[PDB]
Design a protein around this ligand. Sequence first.
Ligand SMILES: OC[C@H]1O[C@H](O)[C@H](O)[C@@H](O)[C@@H]1O
Ligand SMILES: OC[C@H]1O[C@H](O)[C@H](O)[C@@H](O)[C@@H]1O
Ligand SMILES: OC[C@H]1O[C@H](O)[C@H](O)[C@@H](O)[C@@H]1O
Ligand SMILES: OC[C@H]1O[C@H](O)[C@H](O)[C@@H](O)[C@@H]1O
Ligand SMILES: [Mg+2]
Ligand SMILES: [Mg+2]
Ligand SMILES: [Mg+2]
Ligand SMILES: [Mg+2]
Ligand SMILES: [Mg+2]
Ligand SMILES: [Mg+2]
Ligand SMILES: [Mg+2]
Ligand SMILES: [Mg+2]
Lengths: 387, 387, 387, 387
Amino acid sequence: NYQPTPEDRFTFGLWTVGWQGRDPFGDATRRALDPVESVRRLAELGAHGVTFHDDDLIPFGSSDSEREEHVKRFRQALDDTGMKVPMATTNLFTHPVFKDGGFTANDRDVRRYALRKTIRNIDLAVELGAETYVAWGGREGAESGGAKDVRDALDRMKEAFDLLGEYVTSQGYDIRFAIEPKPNEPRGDILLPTVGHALAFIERLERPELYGVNPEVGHEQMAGLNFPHGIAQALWAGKLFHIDLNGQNGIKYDQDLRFGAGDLRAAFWLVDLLESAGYSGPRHFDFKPPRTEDFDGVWASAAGCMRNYLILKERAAAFRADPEVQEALRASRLDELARPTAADGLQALLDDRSAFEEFDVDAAAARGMAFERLDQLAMDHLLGARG
Amino acid sequence: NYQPTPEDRFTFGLWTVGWQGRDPFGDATRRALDPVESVRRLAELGAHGVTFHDDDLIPFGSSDSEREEHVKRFRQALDDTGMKVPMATTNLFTHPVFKDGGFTANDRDVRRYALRKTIRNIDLAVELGAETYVAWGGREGAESGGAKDVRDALDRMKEAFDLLGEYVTSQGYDIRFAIEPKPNEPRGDILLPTVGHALAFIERLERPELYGVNPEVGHEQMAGLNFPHGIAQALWAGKLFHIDLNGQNGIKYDQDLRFGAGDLRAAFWLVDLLESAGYSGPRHFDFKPPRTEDFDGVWASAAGCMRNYLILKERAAAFRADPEVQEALRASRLDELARPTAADGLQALLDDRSAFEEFDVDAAAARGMAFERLDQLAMDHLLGARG
Amino acid sequence: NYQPTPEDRFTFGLWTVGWQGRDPFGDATRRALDPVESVRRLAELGAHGVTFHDDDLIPFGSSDSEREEHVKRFRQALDDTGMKVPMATTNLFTHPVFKDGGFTANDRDVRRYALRKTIRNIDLAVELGAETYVAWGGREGAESGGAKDVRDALDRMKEAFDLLGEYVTSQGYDIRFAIEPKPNEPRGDILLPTVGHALAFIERLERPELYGVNPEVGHEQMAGLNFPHGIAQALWAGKLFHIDLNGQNGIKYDQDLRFGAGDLRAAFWLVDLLESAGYSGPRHFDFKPPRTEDFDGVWASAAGCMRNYLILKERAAAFRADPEVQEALRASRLDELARPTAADGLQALLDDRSAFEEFDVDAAAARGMAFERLDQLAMDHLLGARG
Amino acid sequence: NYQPTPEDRFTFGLWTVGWQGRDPFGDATRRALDPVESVRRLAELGAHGVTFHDDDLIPFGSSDSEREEHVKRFRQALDDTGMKVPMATTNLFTHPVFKDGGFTANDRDVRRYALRKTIRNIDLAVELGAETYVAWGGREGAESGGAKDVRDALDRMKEAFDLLGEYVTSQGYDIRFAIEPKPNEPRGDILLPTVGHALAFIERLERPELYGVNPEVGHEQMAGLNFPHGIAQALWAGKLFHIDLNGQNGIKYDQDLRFGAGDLRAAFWLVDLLESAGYSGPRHFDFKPPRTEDFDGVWASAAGCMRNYLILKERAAAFRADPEVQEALRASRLDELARPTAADGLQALLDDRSAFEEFDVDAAAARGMAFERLDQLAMDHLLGARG
Ligand SMILES: OC[C@H]1O[C@H](O)[C@H](O)[C@@H](O)[C@@H]1O
Ligand SMILES: OC[C@H]1O[C@H](O)[C@H](O)[C@@H](O)[C@@H]1O
Ligand SMILES: OC[C@H]1O[C@H](O)[C@H](O)[C@@H](O)[C@@H]1O
Ligand SMILES: OC[C@H]1O[C@H](O)[C@H](O)[C@@H](O)[C@@H]1O
Ligand SMILES: [Mg+2]
Ligand SMILES: [Mg+2]
Ligand SMILES: [Mg+2]
Ligand SMILES: [Mg+2]
Ligand SMILES: [Mg+2]
Ligand SMILES: [Mg+2]
Ligand SMILES: [Mg+2]
Ligand SMILES: [Mg+2]
């Protein structure tokens, strides 16, 4: 039951199942995974593809020769399995040189290095067939107010993304960029902290059509925000290029639990939205198997990611297909929300006495919205207490 | 010491000092204030002007005749005192008819009523000299996932703001709009929950140049965000039309404490930013004197708002003027952050071996940022432990 | 399906279904309910009983004669229906006289009034058959640091509860007290803000055996705490006298959603714990039907409270009864957690070389905990994707 | 100005200035410090003493011979400088064997190992003169609901602490235990998550007089709680054995900023409380110099910890000594809060018609508390805008 297949478009970062379990207070609990073994094990589980940071695949500081041998091994595993590489990204956060950022480091020579490191991996990603290149500015930010002039930092961030856009267009690459927001951790505050801030920033770039967002469930929830609402605004703007699925229990450190864990009802409304809006991009899991687990637990946790998506998809489809739910949606006037407020125009609205002078405000106020009955039907469907 | 005068541009909402103290669990503790008395008392304290919701000035449901008598009394108090009215707004949240929203209510007849109520007060605001018209969509949102299709709701929100822009341009009014974000309360989640989401939404309106943001200190802090950082992004985008100053102690209900209370160091960095960027709009206080206070406490709390701004302005100016702080800023390379990363261009950057092939990553990584010394100089200046 | 009956011990406050919908930013959306009608409607829904504040039943300031007529009407409705009154409480938060608290008001005459108001309602509660008397100190606290000496306030709080204990013991009443914690709202910070703080305070009272806690789901979640964990500590201490069930979406204002809404997985683990520990007290719902709803929505929301408890009870029972889950619990060594660490004693432990000198730390470290497989079985059971 | 000396009782953990800067997303940015160099550098800065985990001083897995050489080097540095060791603790969180906890690991052999590792370091701590032994149960907890039966885990936690108490009493040691709470990180939820929960747990131990709390500023603030209020309850109970001073910006990952950073006004009210209550224990800094800093920044950050305490102490003393503040405290009736509510007794209170029957509730309700004027005097004193 609920068996994933490649058509479900489930993808995983190499750094997810490969997380060794080292956290701020503890050493690694698992040995390092060979990327070739991860490709083969994920293929057997029914995954569609994998993603990577440059430093996940090529150990930092590798010579041009060692680099080639790592890529060839990886490519052969992809060719044997038919696994895809739909997305790639750069590690601009682990090495100590990035301790004050990559694109917005105060030191200019670090900013130039960060751009050259990124451009090198764009070339590789395009070769492997990636359609989306993700940027997570995890070190862009500050712990103290005087350390970063944020207006200058946004100038430097815009400069960097404009140069990347000039690079891909000059090379004729068919790849787009997605900014992944996070409000904090590892910096005290991170620049572009939410989906909203990232969407607003994109509109000031020279070629906005090349950039979208890669929202992550847990990151918006670290600010206490409604993740389905934020995804809806991204879809409304035409900017949902990619998505990171996982779980998070409220406002605390970034947990990266398996998808379905954390806020389960938010996961249900998210899947309802993605499916009903026809999102066609990868369903990418950015999660960490807890460091309590051995390698059997790693693959159990990865399998649970896909299983929970498929269960929620079934329940959301049954919710929307139920005639009693359709009746409830009409009782709550969800259909009237789709009607234009004033397609008759401004002047007609101003001359309409039923819109103000003769509007019966008390009769309208007395109408119940019937939202609680609708939400209990949604709860019944999620829990399988009806079909 | 620290005496406010009208040139300091301090303004107050009628609903602030006039808050009667009724909260979700308690009845009012103060009698209602006559708006004329508030104008005169605020003028004596050194305020520059006042702001209002329509329903603060004209009791809801007033006839056209009673409406005129309320406005004339108010105008005469303004004329006697020289007090200005730089901003006005609509109450689309108190009356039960708005229980599911104004512009994004599911019921279409409510949405049309909300627009007509708003347009009526724009006319009045322009007559009184307001330059900014604020919209706080406090009822736009939901408690449950099925109650609101957020994509349709954003269509309805865009429709409403586009119609308001068509109205002001057809009337030839010199007034601009500012959206005030809030993440939650009184709805479970509110649409456009942060400065970022509001900035992104503005870019999809038909005439974006007419719209900016009115961020409030406490509202961004209800999402755990850095308020100075968010203000910096608004300034970077050219969209800081107005601002609401108050205090908030972390992630909880909207406290609306007097400015300076709450996160004191964030208040310092905010004033540093506003003054150094040359913000020239009103310094508006959206605060509630706690319901523990009598009327003497109301005016003490209002006076403290202005006093704390003036103290922080002095400390921030002394911080920036100190040669030792200027030296510390250079030691932390704040000046290098202002330099373009690659004004030599993409091709020069790609051919620069010092940017990658011969970049000494370990030497760069070993440089300390000296951020802690800089921040302790900032602390010393805030506390007056140096000048 | 999932029909509640009186044996399920579901109870409701008069103030829950009777909430008129007035919130900090809006007027009431529903008319006031007659307490007699609430008793009859709740009886028809299958509820076991009702609870009340004094001021819910007797309008504040009622003469001794009017008081009697309100009580007689209420008693007759209870007698007609067989409905029970298992708990009562005092309103020490609505009237402006309590704006700085009841038991810990700075003014001594207010503290004496608060005790006399409480004692009067204890007499009534005992007459009606209440077994638990709840105290929620919603106004005990402060917005600013200098307003309240917290050590003196705790002296005054201990004094008040000791006097109440002396009163009930001198009257020979068979009633116990339960303190209901809340971290904030309506005060900036409330004294005894969590279950832990309340449990610790009880141990300093003169007769600790008379006092326990009444934890509320949403209140502990307003501090980001794990509500099942806190309930477990209360059960471990023998102090879970009563419980308030509802829902809350994270760290924000007190939402009081219907039970099952909010954190659904926390609701599942809560019901699992209550049932497996054999909690025998009332399942009391302290919730507010959203002000979007008319009276049909009020009773739908109340019915959903009980329905969701009954569904979760079924799923938790099926989880614990599943042989595959029992196997998983053994694989994760939940049974070894029940074994004493050192029943052989301190000296035996010190002389045991297998406990340190010859302990194979690397072999033990390599054991996986198999927690993810167990949690996915729990998810499958919650969602009805197995039985 | 504000020069620390040993009489100020400032202490530092070896792990604080010695933090190498490795965080969940990045490698170390600083080389390891020799504990002997830390002792000498801290002595030169004016510190009173140092603290340590066992594994800070003796590398894990050291032979009995290597162990002796590490201790002798350390002791000689203490003897040369006169530096004290007032507190020690155990590392039960870094090694992978503790991935599910120490005292509450599901595996019984791990729990026995954790006790033997702790007991070994108690012996060493007593030899070096420690008066307090701290326990931070950082791995005691869970990421998922089924992984930990919390009632059994509390049984195991009580068993462990009872055995430690039996050990110290059988050895005749003059050392007490302090539990350090934290709500989360690195586990999803940690057992005993706040000061309140820890105080309540202590009361169920066999010898409660041996145990107190070691609260940390940032940890209580990770739950959004008022740290001065929690310290006040700990002092009221007689249980403040030790304290961890640092800074934290709201609800997020554990930042461990230098003291004074984070919530500056909470730091002021904390110092006011500690000094006015006559706390005589160490002022211990548990902080991490940000990984942006080199070694000069490490010692600047450590110096700032002590400087900020000394500045706040001066401002709080001036606040309390100001006759205008004393007048304000009387106007807010802080002195009436110290008066017993009913020293005349229960029967006198019941027969007092002025306490209820003839209490003028409206006159009492009309009294303002004058809290805002008092708080602005506190703000003026903190900022040095009066003396
Ligand atoms: O940007 C790709 C990934 O980089 C880092 O691993 C982040 O922790 C993760 O959130 C992000 O998705
Ligand atoms: O929009 C004007 C004002 O309206 C309401 O009173 C809001 O509570 C306040 O935040 C806002 O500034
Ligand atoms: O104490 C009884 C009740 O009093 C108030 O209505 C509180 O809001 C509620 O939480 C509590 O349960
Ligand atoms: O218990 C001693 C110390 O141990 C760990 O380093 C904790 O992170 C710190 O909070 C605690 O004070
Ligand atoms: Mg994450
Ligand atoms: Mg991610
Ligand atoms: Mg506000
Ligand atoms: Mg505002
Ligand atoms: Mg509540
Ligand atoms: Mg309650
Ligand atoms: Mg800490
Ligand atoms: Mg600590």
